[PDB]
Amino acid sequence: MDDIYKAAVEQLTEEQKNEFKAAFDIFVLGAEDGSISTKELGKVMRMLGQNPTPEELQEMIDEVDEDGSGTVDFDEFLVMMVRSMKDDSKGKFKRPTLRRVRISADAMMQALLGARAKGH
Ligand SMILES: Cc1cccc(Nc2ccccc2)c1
């Protein structure tokens, strides 16, 4: 999860997390639990041009998955969101501990965002 980023979502504004909440929701469109499962995640990844396997997807979910559910719920998605836009690979020294397919934040956003980003 990285409580540093877990604080960084708390650091975010209403606006900040608002579009993310939505992208969460649009990530999990039709999801019974409303949490991003590896298929919901896979959905968006394909929405963005990736064709994952749930193995990949689970590790993506795992990065934040605190409840150990195997699903990412909002704050979970949101920590990795902020973790993404803050630093996917800006200028740190991070080792990959799993399939590292990470669509840029706004980039992934744009996948789901056209469900909220207009309509008025
Ligand atoms: C496909 C994709 C690209 C960029 C960010 C995310 N978010 C995410 C969602 C759930 C767990 C970890 C991260 C998903």
UniProtKB/Swiss-Prot annotation:
The gene behind this protein is: TNNC1
Comment field (misc):
Cardiac muscle Tn-C can bind 3 calcium ions per molecule. Domain I does not bind calcium.
Q: Which residues of the parent protein does this chain contain? A: 1 to 90 of 161
What UniProt keywords are attached to this protein's entry?
Acetylation, Calcium, Cardiomyopathy, Disease variant, Metal-binding, Muscle protein, Phosphoprotein, Repeat
Q: Which residues carry this modification: N-acetylmethionine?
A: M1
**Organism annotation:** Homo sapiens
- Upper taxonomic lineage: Eukaryota, Metazoa, Chordata, Craniata, Vertebrata
List positions binding Ca(2+) 1: D65, D67, S69, T71, E76
Query: Superkingdom of the source?
Result: Eukaryota
* The protein's name: Troponin C, slow skeletal and cardiac muscles
GO CC terms on record? cardiac Troponin complex; cytosol; sarcomere; troponin complex
